[PDB]
């Protein structure tokens, strides 16, 4: 992966960590029933002025050694190729070839 | 196969009566692994057939089979560049198997309402020497007769 894509991911994580609480408060206002019926409108108009990259759904999981956007596994933080290389070298405790 | 010997599989007998013939008939009638449906159909058919003849279900069944068993058939050979029909004898297990298959195939094509009724009618016709199964036996024997020169 190019060197700019990884930078994009780092920036996204930073902003999403910065604006976490404000979004939760505004979303609680919008969702909660028996509100003022005008505070709802104002919160809806306010939520869309925050930076777009603060929504956690703009993030994409990547391999931590190459940056690959496909074939990701969550337990290991790597893609299939690197998982296999490490496993055969013996660098993942408890893992081995299985049969049954 | 080429270098194999195949043994026989054990088949349980019928629960109501005690015959393996009837179990094989149920097996040939079943579809998609649903054996209870086939058992129900066969028992209904035999019950309705026993009243029409005043004899036992097994006896009626055997009477129906004895008019459908074949004796000789034809195989295909091609060694001189042409297809020839060669008559051969049929052994007993194959006689029974072919008779059962023809009876079920004939029944499925009838136009009565339920499968039990169709099977009962087909068995009665077979006992009286009528129907598609008996016509099939006749055709096979005719073809085997028209080729005795190649035995």
């Amino acid at each position: 992966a190019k060197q700019s894509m990884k930078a994009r991911e780092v920036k996204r994580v930073a902003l999403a960590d910065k604006y976490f609480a404000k979004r939760a408060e505004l979303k609680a206002i919008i969702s909660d029933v028996n509100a003022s019926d005008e505070d709802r409108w104002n919160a809806v108009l306010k939520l869309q002025t925050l930076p777009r990259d603060s929504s956690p759904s703009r993030q994409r999981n990547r391999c931590r050694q190459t940056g690959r956007p496909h074939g990701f596994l969550r337990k290991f933080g790597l893609s299939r190729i690197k998982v296999r290389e490490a496993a055969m070298r013996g660098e993942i405790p408890g893992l081995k070839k299985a049969s049954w | 196969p080429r270098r194999r010997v195949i043994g026989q599989r054990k088949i349980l007998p019928d629960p109501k009566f005690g015959s393996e013939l009837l179990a094989k008939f149920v097996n040939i009638l079943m579809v998609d692994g649903k054996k209870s449906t086939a058992e129900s159909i066969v028992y209904s058919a035999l019950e309705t057939l026993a009243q029409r003849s005043g004899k036992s279900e097994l006896e009626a069944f055997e009477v129906a089979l004895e008019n459908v068993r074949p004796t000789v058939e034809v195989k295909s050979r091609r060694v001189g560049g042409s297809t020839y029909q060669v008559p051969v004898e049929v052994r007993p297990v194959r006689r029974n198997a072919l008779a059962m298959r023809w009876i079920v195939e004939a029944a499925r094509k009838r136009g009565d309402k339920s499968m039990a009724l169709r099977l009962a009618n087909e068995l009665s016709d077979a006992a009286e020497n009528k129907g598609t199964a008996v016509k099939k036996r006749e055709d096979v024997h005719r073809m085997a007769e028209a080729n005795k020169a190649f035995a």
């Binding site: 931590r64 969550r74 290991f76 013996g90 660098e91 993942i92 405790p93 081995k96 | -």
Partner: protein, 206 residues
């Protein structure tokens, strides 16, 4: 055809692991990354001290690293100053207390990683590949391995068409799961591209 990895297929039968710790789903990936960075740092820093194996353990809330080497004097230095510098940098990388230990390799000619490294080093100085391979085989068999195999692949000697060559002595049974087989690889960077090297050493059944 293609062949299965010897070390991988033998894990848990006659070969041990290179990492030993227990973790859950929320620390597994972070631990793997920290191990990667530690090994990268040490491998860069000790490029001339004949390292062959880096074992890592994580007891409680600390990290302990064991280094297998053929030049323990060069690794330690004058009354441990070099080991201390390594310890401080590793502790900074990991984020927890660190401890470092040293183990000696008695016979460097029977170690698969070091043989491949020596062949690659010779190839980068314009030696003849047949000479290098034959010398490796002769040394290992003289010091008493039950068998050895060497393989080399690439643009050998500067040819335009690539090629693969190999040599073998003794026994190397790769289908027997109780055979103790050592295996490792290395790469060379020349003026014509990359050249690849593989080594197998056999030592007996268990």
């Amino acid at each position: 055809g293609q062949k299965v990895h010897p070390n991988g297929i033998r894990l848990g039968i006659v070969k041990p692991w290179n990492s030993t710790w227990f973790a859950n789903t929320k620390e597994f990936a972070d631990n793997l990354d920290s191990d990667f960075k530690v090994r990268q740092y040490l491998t860069k820093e000790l490029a001339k001290a004949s390292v062959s194996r880096i074992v890592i353990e994580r007891p409680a809330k600390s990290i302990r690293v064991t280094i297998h080497t053929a030049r323990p004097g060069i690794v330690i230095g004058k009354k441990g100053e070099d080991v201390e510098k390594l310890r401080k940098v590793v502790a900074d990388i990991a984020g927890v207390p660190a401890q470092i230990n040293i183990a000696e390799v008695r016979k460097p000619e029977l170690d698969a990683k070091l043989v491949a490294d020596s062949i690659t080093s010779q190839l980068e100085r314009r030696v003849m590949f047949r000479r290098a391979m034959k010398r490796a085989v002769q040394n290992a068999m003289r010091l008493g391995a039950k068998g050895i195999k060497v393989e080399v692949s690439g643009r050998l000697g500067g040819a335009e068409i690539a090629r693969t060559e190999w040599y073998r002595e003794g026994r190397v049974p790769l289908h027997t799961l109780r055979a103790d087989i050592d295996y490792n690889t290395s790469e060379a960077h020349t003026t014509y591209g990359v050249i690849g090297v593989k080594v197998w050493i056999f030592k007996g059944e268990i």
